[PDB]
């Protein structure tokens, strides 16, 4: 197993290809009585390059990427936005990126509540340590 | 400048000393009309060892540490708890640990609101990447 | 990676995700810029896509003869022959014994 | 880091902290100097801010055509095309199948 | 944790950016009955580059920084001044720079006095050794 | 780090943060355990402090003669002489010329 | 010149010698109309080992040193105290240790005043950076 | 550095700075402790001097026969012969041809 | 990793996923075996879980005195003191000045 | 980012812990009109250790793992079974394990058909090469 | 035995030779009452370069290969297609490439059924792990 | 591998699998392209074969004199003499003693 | 690889291909030999299969107590406990809180 | 260290300790010499201070245009532009959006 | 502590600066009934470069220093002179340079006499060995 | 020329020989109208081991040397004394040890005076730098 | 360097500079000390000479039989035979053919 690398490793191949920008996905927005899922394919972006913001019920996903070729460059951007329903519990909203490079913004509705928040402890600028689940 | 190390580096000195457990601090809880600050000296603990939780308005800070000596050990624990006032905006609560090792839990009251939340992007288990402020 | 033979200068980019009228190609001397902008309202808000690709063509290239063409497949290809060589297709007759 | 293509010489500095009329840009042959001075009385006294940025432009640059522009965002950008190349924007028409 | 470096390490990025000069901060001057705090963001300056002086009740903070690029340079300066109130105990004034790079000049008022001064022992030119607090 | 001379086995721990009646010292053969528990209600809730220190004393130590003493300064010291040596303080007279 | 070392380097020779403790010096206390000098020979102590304190007009110099031999140790202590005259300006008191290892506490009387204080900037625990004089 | 011959165990310390009646020598089995304390009022306050020197004598040493002596020069010397050897000075007669 | 002091032999395994009556602990001389079996019908079929943990206790351990206990938390702990040492908890009295 | 390793790397920690066996998951079986999903947490098992079989409409997931300690061992097994509904297209059933170690058996119902099967090309014993999707 | 290499190793010899494209083979299609065999000589292609698809009863084998010489290239392609008989069990179709480089697509007819399918477990993109037969 | 003597430029490819009328040879300046396409219906469907071989002939080669010939054996050979040398076969007479 | 604990000596071989009455197990002191022979006429002739497996058991093994057993699955297992240890299965009772 | 740009040659020395009329600056072709002499009677005798600083200016420097200036601060600065470049200060106008 | 070097080490910085020549010092000449001190800051000169002479009661301090730059040089000189009072004991005059680089010429008056002279033993040209004080 | 070493190098040979102690020399004391010479053979002693003192007109030369053999030692001492005549100029007395190891104490009488004293500049403890004569 | 054969222990020191009655030889168990002191008034004052030589003789040496002898040449030699060997001179007769 040689390909044990970050998901963005193979983005150097795509200097000329511009379909890698977050494409529309199968069942992108999942709206059940339990939660409000948003799944995006951000595989062309480092986590360091992405921005996730929440202004009221408006959720914004943003991303920017620049490479330098010998004498030119290759810029790539996106700006996805979602207005969350009124019944969604804004406090418990939680964003994750798995090793495949698929972002998934999980925000449960007010009814089905977990009651406790695992507050992320911010360390240095742009870094935080979360509670790892244990058995 | 030789002592450019993590704040918990010198905790190996304190195997027998048990005053290093979060002591009561000068102006520990600061309750203004703007925010609700909680400042703790967690310098004896790695960020990986601490837990910060929020069940309703009840905020809990927890910590555990184990060392192995040649034939024995040295355990150290704490459990600090604070019930936040009703007027505090639970959504915007934000915990930080500076390089000195002083935890500070900042939660602004409902009135003075920032309006936007910088959502931490969770990467791997127990890790997240936050938006770094830029000029 | 770009096709830079002594004969010609060719560049193939996939732009299938973008519609033809959304793309802009500009030339500032030996500097080639290809831009793209998408903007469609989603069910719950909106979606945006942007890119900017820049090339610096060598001094050998004859800038007057630049052609930009997007095919049925969606991919855009930019070609321009260098000053000196004649871009002429010539079929060679095949002889047998 | 400065933009030094064979085409042009561009320099982007953020000066948002300083007001436009407080800034001074000077040229002494191939030497470019950008100065800034702030002076506002604080509640308890005063505050001062100062900077001096100096560049040595290569001999290729055409010094007669230097433009210094500060945008809405507050950042100042200085650009000057080199002697030899024509600073002309040219939109290329996009053709389909 | 890769970014375990001095606070001024990332100032090489800012050759062209001139907002890094001590900006006005939230609650810069704190004037209570206990003390007289002054907090500045000197993160763009080495401690070696700063000067803190006291002429009577007039407190002056100064700073200078020079870099050399290939063929040019990038100078940066500031001069902050504060006139301390008459009731402030000038003897006990104490300046510190934390690992984040935030200077904080603490000078308690005459009433609330500590009674003892921890005199800094000057070693070589521009260096001193202070008493480290112990439990 | 513990005092382990051929003469005696001594251990000094600071426990000033804990009150004497809150501490527990136990012995399970050659295993020494020192525990501490604090519990005071804060203004806004409560505060807890806990520690457990464990030592494995070598077989040389005479376990019958163990003394645990907390002084005015708050620090606890545990000492126990090894089997073989007589714990006797003896003042030597000083002679001159 | 081989002996280019700290002044305390040769203290390992003195394991058994106990005259090295600050001896009474020629013209130890110098009391002029200008200043109030105190000169001590602390050559047996690292600057890190010394403490200089000021409680009112009472000035205290303290020092402690421990070595470990194969099976024993060698402790050395001192506690010097001086009550400064009422006419001495307590604010401008200044302690230095030269490369020879001679401490000298200089405190000028109220009349002959320098007017400006070069405030030492404290960096990390027990360290500070002073203004170096320049021509 | 201590004199540890198979014959005897000798220790020489300078204590000239301290007066004889200020010094204390103690023995706790094979552990030798030498303490010193000075306390004189200065013109402007007071001066203190303190030291503690500790030795661990090997099991060969005969502890019953320990002598501590401070000479005119001020230096204290502690000697104790090991169990086995007879501490006897014997002058050898010198013969010629 | 197992607790193997000269005093005792202790083993802590989490078995919270398994119910107490589903577990089997066997001893074959110095060989300790801990087995577990789960069997619950799912909505669409069935689910099975199995484990087998084996330890070889050293010859020092006194096999007659083995105790296996599962607490409220669900974790099982097996302890057995070695032949030679007396498993007796002894609280030491704390003295002050 | 140090923890760029296979998902089963940390299973050596769990020699004594037996909760790591596939636990019941949130929304394990998802039965929509489109597909029939089965999601399992097989993170304690190498892909080489698992078996997935289909006898008629009966789907079986199996797994076995053995470690050797100094003088003992640690065995772990499971056998999950699911009877797929009659309307599920048995031909297009597709099993995947992501880098997190979550198995997901996807089998679409007869109606919503993809029409083409990407047949896996078997190379050596127990290895196959699938068609990688391209833009 | 030096020639212990992949079957495609010697394809670098054939830059100019274009007979290596899957040639017609002896008894290419074998149609018995038991199975429906298709045997092809794909020795000029890496398994990574081939595609095997099934749209209904239509089976398609595809392949592409590109080399770069100093200043030119050598492309090679094929597209073989077979329409499988109605009586063939489409579920149990199974493609293999032996170490000689001969592809063989085995698909048994409905009557003679194995009853169990050894489902290939997909690992990373374009990779899968199959059950290895054991005695 | 291609025959590139100072005398001539020769290229031998086997194309026996393809029929002569199915092949295409093109020249675009110094770029030589050889394409092939086969298409025969199988018993159960169809079979396709395709290839594209491209060469970049050096500037020495005289492009006017290019000959492409496929022999009885099926292999195609492309030869073209370089500008400067005369392609003339000359039989040398053999003399004896 | 053979099971050689201090407790016992166990050997597991698969012999499923051979029928039980075709196998022979012999012991020559500390030397264990397992032989197999198959002989069935094929359609066109005959087929033969043969194997010989030999082990040298250590001197610890008690040779009197050797058991050879072939299960339903076809695999043969040979076990023999070493001299010193008692082969006794003992179920340990499981206690809860 | 001296300022040696392609534009000019500049040298800054501090001479604050010396009075202006005590200093001497000489030029011998491309050789620049700066001398200083102080002479004041002390209370008990006299004090002298002397220095000599020498520079070798490169052949690029235009020697006719050398200016030596001592400011209020006491420091002397010697500047001379090289032959080829025009020493002209030019203020660039600042434009906004 | 990196700056453990000779006092003249940093004189290479001062190629252009000419204030480093012995400046007038605070309390340069100290004339008590005990001794006759002369303190000079010779920190810009190696001890090898200085000359101290005594012609009758006339004491002369001299110094010279030359550096070579790429194509030029930097010379520096001084000549300090002092006429010692008639009551000074010329025999016991003693010059020292501490590690800071401060020369101090100590010559006691006839009354307060030490009685013994520690005669310096001259070794090789320009070198001598003095009696080191011992406790 | 191999024997280019210090004069005391060969003293390790003389562990048992005790004639090497300064022997009486030919014309040891030379008393002319010009000077008062004293010549001693101190070849058995390092310059570091010798002491030369002057109490009034009494001149004392002293020396001590200790070696350590495997289990024993070899001590060697001397104490030479000379009372200088009244007419000798005590100020100009000058001691030297040549490379052969012969000490020579030269002190000229009052009449024949050199007028200038080359004052030895003391550097570190027990070291001094003298003026080297130049042509 | 000392003569330490299995036969005897011999030590030769030159003491010619010292007179016989000025020397002192002492024995403290296995420790041998040789001291010397000279004191003659010079013409202008006095001269002193001192030495102390110490040896540690091995346990093999028989201390009862120690002889110290200073010859005509002035050199002192100390010899003592080890316990076990007989110090006897034996002349061997020389035989011829």
Shortest Cα distance, chain B CAs vs residue F42, angstroms: 8
Report the C-alpha dihedral over residues E97, E101, E105, E106, rounded to 10 degrees. Answer: -70
- Please tell me which of the candidates B21, B74, B81 has its beta carbon nearest to residue F49: B21
Query: How does DSSP classify residue C90?
Result: E
CB atoms within 10 A of CB J87: 10
Strands (E), Q1-97: 3-4, 8-14, 23-28, 31-41, 45-56, 67-70, 75-81
Considering only CB atoms, which chain E residues are within 8 Å of B6?
Answer: 1, 4
Q: Is the dihedral of CA F1, F6, F12, F13 positive or negative?
A: positive
How many CB contacts within 8 angstroms connect chain O with chain P? 103
Task: Identify the three-state secondary structure at position G13.
Answer: helix
Give residues with Cβ within 8 angstroms of N19, minimum separation 6. N38
Residues from K contacting J (CB-CB < 8 Å) are: 47-48, 50-56, 90-91, 93-97, 99, 103, 115-133
- What is the rounded CA–CA span in Å between residue L35 and residue D70? 58
Using alpha carbons, select from I37, I57, I56, I36 the residue that is nearest to residue I46: I37
Q: What is the 3-state secondary structure (H, E, C) of chain A?
A: CCCCCCCCHHHHHHCCECCCCCCCCCCCEEECCCEEEEEEECCCCCHHHEEEEEECCEEEEEEEEEEECCCCEEEEEEEEEEECCCCECHHHCEEEECCCCEEEEEEEECCCCCCEEECCEECCCCCEECCCCCC
What is the DSSP pairing of strand M3-4 with strand L67-70?
unpaired
Using alpha carbons, select from I10, I2, I17, I12 the residue that is nearest to residue I74: I17
Q: How far apart are the first and last CA of chain P?
A: 29
Strands (E), chain O: 29-31, 35-41, 50-55, 58-68, 73-83, 94-97, 102-108, 116-118, 121-122, 128-129
- What is the rounded CA–CA span in Å between residue G20 and residue G9? 13
- Report how far apart, in Å, the C-alpha atoms of A97 and of each of A3, A8, D87, J20 are: 19, 12, 45, 23
Query: How does DSSP classify residue Q44?
Result: S
Query: How does DSSP classify residue E9?
Result: G
- What is the rounded CA–CA span in Å between residue G113 and residue G90? 11
Considering only CB atoms, which chain A residues are within 8 Å of E1?
Answer: 123-124, 127
Query: Residue B119 burial (CB < 10 Å; 0-12/13-18/19+)?
Result: buried
Give chains near I: 3+ CB pairs under 8 A: F, J, M
Shortest Cα distance, chain N CAs vs residue D2, angstroms: 19
Token duo for residue H78: 């502690």
Considering only CB atoms, which chain I residues are within 8 Å of F76?
Answer: 94
- What is the rounded CA–CA span in Å between residue B122 and residue O135? 68
Mutate to test the interface with G, among E110, E119, E131, E134 (most CBs of G within 10 A): E119
Give chains near O: 3+ CB pairs under 8 A: G, N, P
- Report how far apart, in Å, the C-alpha atoms of B109 and of each of A119, B34, B37, B40, B55 are: 18, 6, 10, 20, 17
- What is the rounded CA–CA span in Å between residue B105 and residue L92? 101
- Please, are residues M25 and M18 in contact by the beta-carbon 8 Å criterion? no
**Neighbouring-strand partners of residue I27:** I32, M90
- What is the rounded CA–CA span in Å between residue G46 and residue G38? 18
Q: What is the 3-state secondary structure (H, E, C) of K66-87?
A: EEECCCCEEEEEEEEEEECCCC
Task: Identify the three-state secondary structure at position J38.
Answer: strand
- Please, are residues E41 and B133 in contact by the beta-carbon 8 Å criterion? no
DSSP calls for K2-69: ---S-TTGGGGGGSSB-S-S----TT-EEE-SSEEEEEEE-TTS-GGGEEEEEETTEEEEEEEEEEE-
Query: How does DSSP classify residue M45?
Result: S
Mutate to test the interface with P, among Q10, Q12, Q36, Q48 (most CBs of P within 10 A): Q48
Considering only CB atoms, which chain B residues are within 8 Å of F14?
Answer: 16-19
Considering only CB atoms, which chain N residues are within 8 Å of O75?
Answer: 50-53
Query: How does DSSP classify residue M58?
Result: -
Give residues with Cβ within 8 angstroms of H35, minimum separation 6. H23, H24, H25, H26, H50, H51, H52, H53
Token duo for residue E49: 């580059």
- What is the rounded CA–CA span in Å between residue D69 and residue D75? 8
Token duo for residue B120: 């931490």
- What is the rounded CA–CA span in Å between residue H58 and residue H65? 14
Check residue M4 and give left, alpha or beta (phi > 0: left; psi -120 to 50: alpha). beta
- What is the rounded CA–CA span in Å between residue P34 and residue P85? 13
Token duo for residue F55: 């030592």
Query: Residue Q59 burial (CB < 10 Å; 0-12/13-18/19+)?
Result: exposed
Give residues with Cβ within 8 angstroms of P94, minimum separation 6. O122, P105, P106, P107
Token duo for residue C48: 């945006």
Task: Identify the three-state secondary structure at position O21.
Answer: coil
- What is the rounded CA–CA span in Å between residue D25 and residue N91? 6
Token duo for residue A52: 């996730």
Token duo for residue K4: 């212990």
Backbone angles phi, psi at O9, to 5 degrees: -60, -40
- What is the rounded CA–CA span in Å between residue A16 and residue A12? 9
Using alpha carbons, select from C22, J120, O108 the residue that is nearest to residue K121: J120
- What is the rounded CA–CA span in Å between residue I28 and residue M85? 10
- What is the rounded CA–CA span in Å between residue C55 and residue C11? 9
CB atoms within 10 A of CB B111: 9
Considering only CB atoms, which chain J residues are within 8 Å of A5?
Answer: 4
Using alpha carbons, select from F44, D62, F61, K67 the residue that is nearest to residue L55: K67
- Please tell me which of the candidates E50, E118, E123 has its beta carbon nearest to residue G47: E123
- What is the rounded CA–CA span in Å between residue B39 and residue Q4? 78
Report the C-alpha dihedral over residues P83, P85, P91, P93, rounded to 10 degrees. Answer: -60
Backbone angles phi, psi at L22, to 5 degrees: -90, -15
- What is the rounded CA–CA span in Å between residue H95 and residue L75? 121
Query: Residue N5 burial (CB < 10 Å; 0-12/13-18/19+)?
Result: middle
CB-CB under 8 Å, H25 with F95: no
Mutate to test the interface with C, among L21, L22, L23, L28 (most CBs of C within 10 A): L28
- What is the rounded CA–CA span in Å between residue O26 and residue P120? 25
Using alpha carbons, select from J109, J129, J111, J132 the residue that is nearest to residue J121: J129
Q: What is the 3-state secondary structure (H, E, C) of D28-97?
A: ECCEEEEEEEEEEECCCEEEEEEEEEEEECCCCECCCCCEEEECCCCEEEEEEEECCCCCCCEEECCEEC
CB-CB under 8 Å, I66 with M5: no
Q: What is the 3-state secondary structure (H, E, C) of chain H?
A: CCEECCCEEEEEEECCCCCHHHEEEEEECCEEEEEEEEEEECCCEEEEEEEEEEEECCCCECCCCCEEEECCCCEEEEEEEECCCCCCEEECCEEEC
- What is the rounded CA–CA span in Å between residue H21 and residue H35? 11
CB-CB under 8 Å, A48 with B119: no
Angle at O57 between CA O53 and CA O61, to 5 degrees: 30
Give residues with Cβ within 8 angstroms of C86, minimum separation 6. L29
- What is the rounded CA–CA span in Å between residue H46 and residue H36? 17
- What is the rounded CA–CA span in Å between residue O30 and residue O108? 11
A–B touching, 3+ CB–CB pairs within 8 Å:
yes
Check residue F74 and give left, alpha or beta (phi > 0: left; psi -120 to 50: alpha). left
User: What distance lies between CA Q78 and its chain's CA centroid?
Assistant: 2
- What is the rounded CA–CA span in Å between residue E18 and residue B135? 9
- What is the rounded CA–CA span in Å between residue L55 and residue K33? 50
- What is the rounded CA–CA span in Å between residue I2 and residue I10? 6
**Neighbouring-strand partners of residue H82:** H61
DSSP calls for F15-56: -TTS-GGGEEEEEETTEEEEEEEEEEE-SSEEEEEEEEEEEE
Give chains near D: 3+ CB pairs under 8 A: C, E, N
How many CB contacts within 8 angstroms connect chain F with chain H? 45
Using alpha carbons, select from D27, D24, D75 the residue that is nearest to residue D50: D24
Backbone angles phi, psi at O78, to 5 degrees: -155, 160
Task: Identify the three-state secondary structure at position B48.
Answer: helix
Q: Which domains does chain I have, with CATH numbers?
A: 1-97 (2.60.40.790)
Shortest Cα distance, chain F CAs vs residue B99, angstroms: 23
Query: How does DSSP classify residue K100?
Result: T
Q: How many residues does chain Q have?
A: 97
CB-CB under 8 Å, P123 with O47: yes
Strands (E), P43-101: 50-55, 58-68, 73-83, 94-97
- Please tell me which of the candidates B5, B19, B99 has its beta carbon nearest to residue E100: B99
- What is the rounded CA–CA span in Å between residue C70 and residue B123? 39
Backbone angles phi, psi at E3, to 5 degrees: -80, 60
- What is the rounded CA–CA span in Å between residue B86 and residue B93? 13
Query: How does DSSP classify residue B47?
Result: G
Shortest Cα distance, chain D CAs vs residue N87, angstroms: 7
CB atoms within 10 A of CB O59: 26
- What is the rounded CA–CA span in Å between residue B107 and residue H75? 69
Using alpha carbons, select from E73, K68, A60 the residue that is nearest to residue L55: K68
- Please, are residues K87 and K110 in contact by the beta-carbon 8 Å criterion? yes
- What is the rounded CA–CA span in Å between residue G120 and residue G124? 12
What is the DSSP pairing of strand A94-97 with strand B121-122?
parallel
Check residue C29 and give left, alpha or beta (phi > 0: left; psi -120 to 50: alpha). left
Task: Give the method used.
Answer: X-ray
Considering only CB atoms, which chain I residues are within 8 Å of F71?
Answer: 96-97
CB-CB under 8 Å, A22 with C49: yes
**Neighbouring-strand partners of residue J128:** J122, K128
Q: Is the dihedral of CA P115, P121, P125, P126 positive or negative?
A: negative
- What is the rounded CA–CA span in Å between residue L57 and residue L11? 10
Using alpha carbons, select from J107, J113, J114 the residue that is nearest to residue J93: J107
Query: How does DSSP classify residue O70?
Result: S
Shortest Cα distance, chain B CAs vs residue A69, angstroms: 26
Mutate to test the interface with P, among Q10, Q12, Q44 (most CBs of P within 10 A): Q44
Using alpha carbons, select from N59, N68, N9, N1 the residue that is nearest to residue N30: N59
Using alpha carbons, select from A110, A6, A96 the residue that is nearest to residue A57: A110
- Please, are residues K123 and J97 in contact by the beta-carbon 8 Å criterion? yes
- Please, are residues A79 and C48 in contact by the beta-carbon 8 Å criterion? yes
CB atoms within 10 A of CB H13: 22
- Please, are residues J106 and J94 in contact by the beta-carbon 8 Å criterion? yes
DSSP calls for N39-67: EEE-SSEEEEEEEEEEEE--TTB-TTS-E
Shortest Cα distance, chain I CAs vs residue F75, angstroms: 10
Shortest Cα distance, chain E CAs vs residue D10, angstroms: 12
Token duo for residue E68: 């050399």
CB-CB under 8 Å, C28 with D7: yes
What is the DSSP pairing of strand D90-92 with strand C23-28?
antiparallel
Shortest Cα distance, chain F CAs vs residue B37, angstroms: 12
User: What distance lies between CA F93 and its chain's CA centroid?
Assistant: 32
- What is the rounded CA–CA span in Å between residue N23 and residue N15? 9
- What is the rounded CA–CA span in Å between residue M37 and residue M49? 6
Considering only CB atoms, which chain H residues are within 8 Å of F88?
Answer: 28-29
Using alpha carbons, select from P101, P58, P108 the residue that is nearest to residue P79: P58
- What is the rounded CA–CA span in Å between residue J69 and residue J87? 48
- What is the rounded CA–CA span in Å between residue D55 and residue E74? 9
Resolution in A: 3.6
CB atoms within 10 A of CB C83: 12
Enclosing H/E stretch for Q83: none
- What is the rounded CA–CA span in Å between residue A112 and residue P9? 93
Q: Is the dihedral of CA L13, L14, L17, L19 positive or negative?
A: positive
- What is the rounded CA–CA span in Å between residue Q15 and residue H96? 13
Using alpha carbons, select from B60, B53, L26, H64 the residue that is nearest to residue C89: L26
Write down the residue that tokens 């930080």 correspond to. B96
CB-CB under 8 Å, C53 with A81: no
């Amino acid at each position: 197993f040689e390909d044990m690398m970050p998901y963005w490793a193979q983005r150097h191949s795509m200097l000329n290809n511009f379909n890698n920008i977050v494409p529309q996905q199968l069942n992108e927005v999942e709206n059940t009585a339990q939660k409000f899922c948003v799944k995006l394919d951000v595989a062309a972006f480092k986590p360091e390059e992405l921005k996730v913001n929440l202004e009221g019920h408006v959720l914004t996903i943003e991303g920017h990427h620049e490479v330098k070729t010998e004498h030119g460059f290759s810029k790539r951007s996106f700006t996805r936005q979602f207005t969350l329903p009124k019944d969604v519990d804004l406090a418990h909203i939680h964003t994750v990126i798995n090793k495949e490079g698929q972002m998934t913004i999980d925000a449960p509705k007010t009814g089905s509540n977990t009651t406790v928040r695992a507050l992320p402890i911010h360390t240095s600028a742009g870094h935080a340590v979360t509670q790892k689940p244990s058995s």
